[PDB]
Structures are given as C-alpha cells and as structure tokens.
Design a protein around this ligand. Structure first.
Ligand SMILES: O=C(O)CNC(=O)C(=O)O
Ligand SMILES: [Mg+2]
Ligand code: NI
Ligand SMILES: [Zn+2]
Length: 331
C-alpha cells in the first residue's frame, strides 16, 4: 500500500505531465497521495496562471465577511458578520492596515504559534466565495475555469444526465482569516491555487480517519452536535493542532505559497488560515473514485448548511433515500 503513514505528498510535474489533468490526479493517487487528504502540486517553471496581477483592484467583494470567534483559543467557533461591499484595492489596503496586518514574526512556525494563541481576540475580514476566475483564458494547463465538470463526470460514470454547473470561486484573505474544519460538499475533491500574496497554512485529517475527527468534534461542540448530526457541514468549528495531538487525532500540516496548487481528496477534513493579504481560486471536481464517496457523504438537513443549486442533483441521484429530508433543509 502506497503512503501508509498518510503523509502529505508534494509533486513537481514536468510541463509534459501538466497537460492532462485527470491523468496526473490518477498518477498522484497511484503514489498514495490521497491517503493524506491533501497534496501540494508545484507547477513546472514554464507555466504561469496569467501574465500579471497588476489589474485586479477593481474586482468587487460584494459581501466581505468579518469572522467573529467564540470559545477558547484552541477550540472555538466563528460566525460570519456581513460587511459593506468593497473593492479588492480597498480590501488590500485594509488587510495592510495596522489593525489587520501580519505581525512581525521569525518564520512560519512562529506565525502559526501566534495564530493559535491570538486568533480568537481579533475579527479578520475575509472575501470569500466570489464567483469568478483569475486564470488567463489562454492558460491551457490546470486552468481551474476549464476543468471537466462534475455533472459530466457523473454522466460519464453513471449514465444519467443532470442539470447544474461547476464554476470557480475567488478568496481574498488577510492575516488570521480562517477556514473551519470541513470536507467538501458531497465529499468532492477540491483544487486551490494561491494566485498571489502571503501564504495559507493547511491542516488535514487522512480520509481513513475522518470519523475520529467527527467524534472529537461532537465531544468539543456538544450543543452543535445535538442540533445537527453533520454539523461540520456548517463550516464554523475550529480545533487547534495542540488539541488534536492531545486527543490522538491523526493529522498533518503544510504551508502553501503563492504559485502553488493544493488538492483536497474525498472525505479529507481540512482547516487553515491565511498569513496576510492573499488571493486564492478554488473549485470542486470529481473523478471515478469519488462516486463511492459521494454516495456515502453525510448531509446536514437542519437548515444551516445551505448550498449551491448543483448539489440538488448529486443528492437526488446518489442519495435518493436522503433526498426528501435534505431538500426540506434546503427550503
Ligand atoms: O482557501 C480557503 O479559504 C478555503 N479553501 C478550501 O477549503 C478548499 O480549497 O477546499
Ligand atoms: Mg480590476
Ligand atoms: Ni475546502
Ligand atoms: Zn446542520
């Protein structure tokens, strides 16, 4: 069995290997990459996402989200307070202001210590989930707006044609902006490209051990667990590495830098934080190996998780027994 310790693997494809996206994902899996839940892909030196980032300041963040924490430093939830619209140029200036800028630090490890010590005492503002793309249309390799769609994959594997679309999303971050512990909708893959700016630190639980994280989360967030049998779908709960180690939960960590891709694999729980002003692009995708995970994915039916139009068909076809209850949670 490849990668039996479930370590995060780092790949360096050549320009030739970068041509065929599906083939490269299957390659990485042949080497055991999925066992970690997360992999890093460093593009060949010849590749670029676009020519420059000099002209992005007029992109609108219609609903910036202020991430307000409650709890203790290593075990907290966050809620998202909506703020007034602002442009990327306005947000960048805000991120660089004395109130929000990255503090002085020695290295990534020191910054990670500071994040876990101090996150809860601040409320950073995140531009998340903005439909759009920063890939040049002429970038032919690993262009996250030109991937094969999940609807087409389900149709190819299962024969059923379904409605829905699959487009990328932009994320504009600042120091301490936080992504809570989650798997993807329908336990899909994700791919994330850090276009510019400061790093993003990731934490991940191997898919084979995801239920250990879920059981800890039910212990640590007992009211939320009574409210919903899949409350991590709400994407609000944070647990620090120190707390995970105290409770014996298997996990790994890695820092993504600008110019790097990360892939999350089906049922790989992940969480993390941004180091400073940055912009990332991410999208979900599927492969044949996903289908079995999609059929078994948990679902939130309490009303909180509320998701895209396109998840309807995935539930309806892969999880017909759950469909009626889930759809009630959508309405
Ligand atoms: O970058 C972020 O804030 C969160 N991204 C992801 O969870 C991802 O790409 O799957
Ligand atoms: Mg612009
Ligand atoms: Ni994710
Ligand atoms: Zn719920």
């Amino acid at each position: 069995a490849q990668n039996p310790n479930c370590n995060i693997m780092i790949f360096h494809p050549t320009k030739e290997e970068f041509n065929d996206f599906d083939k490269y994902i299957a390659y990485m899996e042949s080497q055991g990459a999925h066992r970690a839940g997360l992999a890093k892909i460093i593009p060949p030196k010849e590749w670029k996402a676009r020519e420059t980032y000099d002209n992005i300041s007029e992109i609108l963040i219609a609903t910036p989200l202020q991430q307000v924490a409650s709890g203790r430093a290593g075990v907290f939830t966050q809620y998202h307070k909506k703020k007034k619209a602002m442009t990327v140029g306005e947000y960048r200036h805000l991120a660089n202001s004395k109130k929000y800028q990255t503090p002085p630090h020695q290295n990534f490890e020191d910054l990670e210590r500071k994040y876990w010590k101090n996150r809860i005492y601040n409320s950073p503002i995140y531009g998340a989930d903005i439909s759009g793309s920063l890939f040049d249309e002429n970038t032919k390799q690993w262009n996250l707006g030109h991937l094969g769609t999940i609807q087409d994959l389900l149709e190819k594997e299962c024969g059923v044609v379904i409605e829905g679309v699959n487009t990328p999303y932009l994320y504009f971050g600042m120091w301490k902006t936080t992504f809570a512990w989650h798997t993807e909708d329908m336990d899909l893959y994700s791919i994330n490209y850090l276009h510019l700016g400061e790093p993003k630190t990731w934490y991940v639980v191997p898919p084979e051990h995801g239920q250990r994280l879920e059981r800890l989360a039910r212990e640590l967030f007992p009211g939320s667990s009574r409210g919903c049998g899949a409350f991590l779908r709400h994407k609000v709960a944070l647990i620090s590495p120190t707390v995970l180690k105290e409770n014996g939960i298997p996990f790994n960590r890695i820092t993504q830098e600008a110019g790097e891709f990360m892939v999350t694999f089906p049922y790989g729980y992940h969480a993390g934080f941004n180091h400073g002003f940055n912009c990332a692009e991410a999208i979900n995708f599927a492969t044949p190996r996903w289908i079995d995970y999609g059929k078994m994915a948990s679902q939130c039916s309490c009303g909180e998780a509320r998701v895209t139009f396109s998840m309807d068909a995935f539930v309806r076809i892969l999880q017909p027994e759950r469909y009626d209850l889930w759809k009630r949670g959508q309405d």
